[PDB]
Design a protein around this nucleic acid. Sequence first.
DNA 1: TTTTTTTTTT
DNA 2: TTTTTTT
Lengths: 219, 218, 220, 220
Amino acid sequence: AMLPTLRTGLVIAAGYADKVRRVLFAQLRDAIKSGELSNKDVAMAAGNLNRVLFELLVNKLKADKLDVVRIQIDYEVRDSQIQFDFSTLRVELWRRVPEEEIAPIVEDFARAAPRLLEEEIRFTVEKVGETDVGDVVYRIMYRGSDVGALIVTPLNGEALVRGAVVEPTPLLLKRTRVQVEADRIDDFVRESVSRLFSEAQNVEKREAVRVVNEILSLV
Amino acid sequence: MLPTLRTGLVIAAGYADKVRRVLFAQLRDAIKSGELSNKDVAMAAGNLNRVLFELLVNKLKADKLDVVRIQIDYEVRDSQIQFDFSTLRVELWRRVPEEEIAPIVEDFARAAPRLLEEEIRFTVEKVGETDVGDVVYRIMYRGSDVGALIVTPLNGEALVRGAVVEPTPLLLKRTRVQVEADRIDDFVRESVSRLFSEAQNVEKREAVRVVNEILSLV
Amino acid sequence: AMLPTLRTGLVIAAGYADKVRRVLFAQLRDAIKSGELSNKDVAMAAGNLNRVLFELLVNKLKADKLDVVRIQIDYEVRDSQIQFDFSTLRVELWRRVPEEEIAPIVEDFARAAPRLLEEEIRFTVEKVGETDVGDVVYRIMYRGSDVGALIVTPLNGEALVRGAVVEPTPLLLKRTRVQVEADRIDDFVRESVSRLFSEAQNVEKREAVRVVNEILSLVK
Amino acid sequence: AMLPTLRTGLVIAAGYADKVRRVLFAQLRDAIKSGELSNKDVAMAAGNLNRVLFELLVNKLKADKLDVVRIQIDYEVRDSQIQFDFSTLRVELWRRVPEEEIAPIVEDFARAAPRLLEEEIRFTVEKVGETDVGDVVYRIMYRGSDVGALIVTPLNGEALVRGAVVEPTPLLLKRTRVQVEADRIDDFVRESVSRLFSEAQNVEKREAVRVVNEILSLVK
DNA sequence: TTTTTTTTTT
DNA sequence: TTTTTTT
């Protein structure tokens, strides 16, 4: 039987304690109201966990209070008692990069940002293969790295284009008809890929990711 | 003053969907009024994400498993969103490898039930007295200041109140004990750890304010 | 033009105050750290607002402490002081439906739910039109209400079928090739739509919603 | 042994499905990475639950998509399989109050708001009892309803006053020394309680609640 | 086309 | 990647 898991999510090390206490109270809200637990039992349980985590985070790992941690642990509630399974204790740590190292870089970049904000991104492609019914699949790239996929369906004298990229920003190229005879497909894609995505939809990452995988799966 | 887009803590791999969701949440009202369209906002979030990609991946060389926090002011004028890049702020936290943390976490996990039963040793030091004659002590944990304690002398009796922030936020309820005023200082040093063994587990901010309340009286 | 906005989002009326406090501190974190404001200034501002909002909810709106509210208001910071624009004040209210009215319905339904959990989602379709290049687009319905869309591309003895529904649960029909002559498409689609979505992907609502439109826009 | 519980929290009825899917995926992430479950297993589980909830919310409870729902249900993972316990299913519903009924009330209130924002919170008190060491405890009331507590410690011609209120906004009265004779305590408190809290700290509700309970526990 | 909405804080 | 987080 699977056990409930106490998860903090991403939190600044200085505030993990109040995060652990509030999450645990939220999960055991029904248990308290049902009468299986008291508010004292839960607060005491969280306090003991926080007591343990303090030694781990501050002493063993030397985490600064401005660092970021993510903590999770399974726990069991049986017969009016809360018990943690410390074999399930998992702790993630992120160490802070000093402002003196980031602020000047961001400030420098901020001056060049309004130019970059309007520029069209410019992509490159490479043919991946063809389907049984004659669709052509391309890999779409940004700066030599793979960032998306594209599929072209030649039809009665014309072609249909669909695709999506994940980086530098999630874009979805909706089903688009272009003036191309099947003879002109491979040439057209290389000439028009950057231009097609200038009118693409700005979507969420997972939406773009799914389409990329859908298109690449057909090969 | 301008509206600010704030992401909060987010894994670098998912900053884009975070920026998009924050911006849409803030500008829902402008859309329904007809001042903006979903296209207008999505293009705005998309263009910002395009900008942040160069900053995070190339300039800051951030791995996608790191944590970032981004904020920037923006203004909406005549059905368009315009960012003020002078207000752009980016925070970065770099990932500590699992091979450096997991074994340390593993060994401690064996020692956790042992430590959990142990009572939390505190030590104290005299700070001063209040206007009405209360005695204030500074509570220390492993030599470091973590809380405060206040004792109100009576006739053959004393009232004790206090709070600690570390290693876990505790609140010492108003407690009356039978002790003569002459031996209070000895009482505090010998019994402070025993007092907090029956203390309340509270939130950090509650403990913090009580500590400052007690220290402010000096 | 636009002013910063303090937004609570959905919150139980009993806890709106701590929400207003936490949001305002989060938004003015920088102002405090810069020295333009003090922690005292922000706490006092949120407290005064919450005092006012209490009067509105309990007296004017007659909100129960177990109801749900959503509050937003614009504010500006002038000379180390926080000043609200109450003309921008917006308050939404949801009144709780008594447990005595909902619990028996949920309890009754909970008994029949796991059997329903297995059943195939019988769908029906309606032809919407043909695309410029000859794809056929159908509207998918569930219990007479439109819930999704489907597009079919005729081939030589074969067809390509794509689609998505939003209700009763978001499903995505991946690109599927089937054995059917073009004269038989309209018959095939209507006969197999429920069967096709029985093996479809469980996706997010927004994914299904977006796909429906991509398909429906091609006719409209 | 207790089971994991899927909790959505407050969500607009139109967006419950994606809420359920994301919460379930967040809880079962580790199970997926370990290989005990696949993304398909979790997606199918959330999809089946949403299919069931659709009938409950839309058909049985007649919930409008602008309403607010809160859904929770226990589930079990046994041998690479997800199982919901529908006996543990709980659904709360809040029905939306129309803007046409709230906006005029908010707008008129918005006109008197900048005036009210300056105003001090008039309070009343009532004697509850005395402590063992002779402190006097009062119940603080706002609109006839109990909202807080206050404790007075008598000195020689002086007193120490401490207290906290929960409504209309969480306020905590720091340790304050005042000039009052012990017989005139009941009288002093009733004249000054509102004035004392005009300089009290704006805090979170839970801070105030605990101080209130601490003061009341001291009463016999 | 959604039709509701996509945060910060916690 | 993804959440809950005062009756």
